[PDB]
Amino acid sequence: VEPALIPSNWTSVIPLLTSDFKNQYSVISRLKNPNMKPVPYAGDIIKLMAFINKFSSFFHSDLQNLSFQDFEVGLDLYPGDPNGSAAGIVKGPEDTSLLLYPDFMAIKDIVYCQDKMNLLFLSLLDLTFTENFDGKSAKKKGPLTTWENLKSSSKKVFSNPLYRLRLVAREWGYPREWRQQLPSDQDISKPKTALFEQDEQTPVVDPSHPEILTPNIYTWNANEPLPLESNPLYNREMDKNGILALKPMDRVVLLRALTDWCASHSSAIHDEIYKLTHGKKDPVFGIQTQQVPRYTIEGVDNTINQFKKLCSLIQSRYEIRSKKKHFVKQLKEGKKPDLSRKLEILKEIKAELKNAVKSEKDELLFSLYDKWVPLFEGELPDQPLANPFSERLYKLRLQEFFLGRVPHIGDFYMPRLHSYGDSLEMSTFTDLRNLQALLSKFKNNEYNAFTLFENDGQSMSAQFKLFYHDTPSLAHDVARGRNTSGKVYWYELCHDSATLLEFLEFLDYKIVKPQDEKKEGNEKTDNKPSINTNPLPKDAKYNTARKKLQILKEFLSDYYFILRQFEQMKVQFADMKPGKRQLRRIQRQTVN
Amino acid sequence: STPSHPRMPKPHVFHSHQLQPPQLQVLYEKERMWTAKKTGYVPTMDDVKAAYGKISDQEEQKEKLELLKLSVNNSQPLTEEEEKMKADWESEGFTNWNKLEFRKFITVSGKYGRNSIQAIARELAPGKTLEEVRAYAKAFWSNIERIEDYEKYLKIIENEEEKIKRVKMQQEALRRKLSEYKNPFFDLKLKHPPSSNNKRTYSEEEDRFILLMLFKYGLDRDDVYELVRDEIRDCPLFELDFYFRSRTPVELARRGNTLLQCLEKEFNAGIVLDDAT
């Protein structure tokens, strides 16, 4: 007769994504396959989408369905080159010939991706400037950034907003990219570099209080903007034109610079982060810097067990009644609502254990989640089966796109727009239950790409990318000295469902438990054709990794079907307005 | 042509305490009464009421019958042996400082501290060179006791020194705290600073980061946190840490002072610098 409760052990599907995991110098690159390609701008582009997502309520609809690629195509970016953007795209796994987008796709299809970005560029501006004189009274949702403003027959389209930014640009701090560096070498931002007096102090002026607080004045040289000679922010071409005026790489810089400035000056969103960073209830696991869903690290098969354990513990939570004579006999309104259910919930588990005969552990879950909820209400407000992407408590520091991290390797991400909001019917951003159920419907072919177009599937990120983050390197590099300026930590793993499979087949070489310790016996300064790296779990140290790798092969194997449909969705229905009358005929059209 | 009664009554020449021979007033009240006799002046009420300042009655006429006689038998201006005193006395007095100028000296000494002669002798250059700002400085303290107002003077100067010393203390206190960790960006843990009465909006890791950057640029008189704000944004780690990224130099310096203060409550046992030279 003694209950027990541990909130941190059964978080609402939100383990603390700590940085200490990889506190040991462990960075490798034996994953060099034709599909893996460095993408310097990947990081900023990701942030740019993450920002859109977390504040999708403030942005336009057409802005919250951007595919990662829509940025590449839009800003004329190209993966590969560790410097900026590659010269072009590698046509097929074997050609060694590059080509640009105007060759790859069509022009109207490109101007489309371009328009999006400008809308994004103008929306960001107005969001921080023209939307600072707000005077709400309940809830704002009207004044946004119309798709007409961008396509206005005026010149002050960007001219006006930029005028404001050009004024605050100085104080708000320029991005490293554009900051006037000091090649002088004789001066460094960190320490001081200018004495005022060649002699300090010696003969005290008040011997009664020998102190001398200010020996002499020093003057420092902080982060200053690039000269008008080459300052991208003052590009005259940008006014009349759009954001495309700047260099492709620069364009990304600006959009990032904005996504930060806006976060620090937009009276709208800055007051919004406050509303999200000041919850009357703090996350049981404290307030860490980064947060990810449970399954993105625990795994599907491991998160289902955590719920079984949870149920076995919340059963004891009631069977510990030391003085139930007070609750059972006396019938008072307030404490009885719980007591009443304490009888049904028990006469239901007995209506399954005795009414199944080892039928399946499936019914021992799929038909319990609904009734267990009312029980949790009180003890553990959070459990490993609630929709993580539907709780204002985790929202902010939560990190979507996160797919997991493998020890001595790093994290893995995947740009997918529109996480929370409306019509999240198809969105993969839901509780492990509905999620693994949704993916299962595409794997079994029950749900066609057609159903997407029927359930606002186009409100999501059609195309997709699977990136890998070299967190270990970055973590250490930052732990020592901030000489990160010029390094790369983001790496593309695939660009479409097709290559996604190639990556899953490539993922097998690592998940394998090294048993081959003999000789092949086949008898009849660094150069590598493509990829010949298989050995990974050498020592028993990387044992923990083999598992976190396999679980990833799972998510990606199930995420495959739903993603292949999203692709086909945009190919068929190109952001086509479904309508009403036409919405039906397409159903009975039978397209074979 | 025109009378106009040209006759200097009893003018004075002693403003607020600008450090000058307190006994000169008497030496002046001799030629100051002579400048009235030589020109023939009639002692009235404007003089007596401005020489004692009292609404007396029967013993009020005596003063009017005194100040009058003092001017009547006022001997020739200070003797030749007394004249040589004039220059000497007033030569010691630093009355050559405008009230506005003086009131700046007792202010710059605040954000610059007691004996920072150069630091203050530069942010003015009024009367003359540094030597002036030093001479009057030494003279100030050495003979300050002769104060006209030390209430809102010797306190507004001292008080600012406390703050300066506290900041310089937090600086040095921080230095030693970092030398206590090999990799501070991980193993750094505050003993007393850990708060609770307020919502910890910042990540525990973040606080650790903003400290590493305070140590990076020290705690200079002015601009400091605007660099932290930059350093934060520059780092690719918090590339998605939206809250952190959104911290303005102001709403970020806030957390800074909070940490410094809390750090102060820790290393306040070893802040006794041995002064036995």
PDB file of N, CA, C and O in Angstrom, chain A residues 149-158 239-240:
ATOM      1  N   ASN A 149       0.058  43.230 -52.162  1.00  0.00           N
ATOM      2  CA  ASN A 149       1.094  44.207 -51.851  1.00  0.00           C
ATOM      3  C   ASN A 149       2.339  43.959 -52.688  1.00  0.00           C
ATOM      4  O   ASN A 149       2.920  44.885 -53.253  1.00  0.00           O
ATOM      5  N   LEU A 150       2.741  42.695 -52.760  1.00  0.00           N
ATOM      6  CA  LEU A 150       3.910  42.305 -53.531  1.00  0.00           C
ATOM      7  C   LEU A 150       3.700  42.626 -55.005  1.00  0.00           C
ATOM      8  O   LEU A 150       4.590  43.161 -55.666  1.00  0.00           O
ATOM      9  N   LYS A 151       2.515  42.303 -55.512  1.00  0.00           N
ATOM     10  CA  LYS A 151       2.182  42.565 -56.908  1.00  0.00           C
ATOM     11  C   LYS A 151       1.462  43.898 -57.070  1.00  0.00           C
ATOM     12  O   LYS A 151       0.452  43.988 -57.767  1.00  0.00           O
ATOM     13  N   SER A 152       1.986  44.932 -56.421  1.00  0.00           N
ATOM     14  CA  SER A 152       1.392  46.260 -56.508  1.00  0.00           C
ATOM     15  C   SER A 152       2.057  47.072 -57.613  1.00  0.00           C
ATOM     16  O   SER A 152       3.264  46.966 -57.833  1.00  0.00           O
ATOM     17  N   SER A 153       1.265  47.880 -58.310  1.00  0.00           N
ATOM     18  CA  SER A 153       1.780  48.699 -59.400  1.00  0.00           C
ATOM     19  C   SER A 153       2.445  49.966 -58.872  1.00  0.00           C
ATOM     20  O   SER A 153       2.224  51.061 -59.388  1.00  0.00           O
ATOM     21  N   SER A 154       3.261  49.806 -57.835  1.00  0.00           N
ATOM     22  CA  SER A 154       3.988  50.926 -57.252  1.00  0.00           C
ATOM     23  C   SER A 154       5.475  50.613 -57.161  1.00  0.00           C
ATOM     24  O   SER A 154       5.907  49.500 -57.464  1.00  0.00           O
ATOM     25  N   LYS A 155       6.258  51.603 -56.746  1.00  0.00           N
ATOM     26  CA  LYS A 155       7.695  51.429 -56.612  1.00  0.00           C
ATOM     27  C   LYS A 155       8.057  51.299 -55.138  1.00  0.00           C
ATOM     28  O   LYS A 155       9.024  50.630 -54.777  1.00  0.00           O
ATOM     29  N   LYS A 156       7.260  51.944 -54.291  1.00  0.00           N
ATOM     30  CA  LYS A 156       7.505  51.951 -52.855  1.00  0.00           C
ATOM     31  C   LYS A 156       7.139  50.614 -52.220  1.00  0.00           C
ATOM     32  O   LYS A 156       6.972  50.520 -51.002  1.00  0.00           O
ATOM     33  N   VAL A 157       7.013  49.584 -53.051  1.00  0.00           N
ATOM     34  CA  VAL A 157       6.717  48.240 -52.571  1.00  0.00           C
ATOM     35  C   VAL A 157       7.742  47.822 -51.526  1.00  0.00           C
ATOM     36  O   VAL A 157       7.399  47.554 -50.374  1.00  0.00           O
ATOM     37  N   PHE A 158       9.005  47.768 -51.938  1.00  0.00           N
ATOM     38  CA  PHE A 158      10.099  47.461 -51.025  1.00  0.00           C
ATOM     39  C   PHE A 158      10.796  48.746 -50.591  1.00  0.00           C
ATOM     40  O   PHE A 158      11.419  48.799 -49.531  1.00  0.00           O
ATOM     41  N   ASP A 239      15.478  48.063 -54.318  1.00  0.00           N
ATOM     42  CA  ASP A 239      14.284  48.895 -54.177  1.00  0.00           C
ATOM     43  C   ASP A 239      13.238  48.596 -55.247  1.00  0.00           C
ATOM     44  O   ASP A 239      12.226  47.947 -54.978  1.00  0.00           O
ATOM     45  N   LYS A 240      13.486  49.078 -56.461  1.00  0.00           N
ATOM     46  CA  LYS A 240      12.567  48.874 -57.574  1.00  0.00           C
ATOM     47  C   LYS A 240      12.312  47.389 -57.811  1.00  0.00           C
ATOM     48  O   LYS A 240      11.175  46.972 -58.027  1.00  0.00           O
TER      49      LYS A 240
END
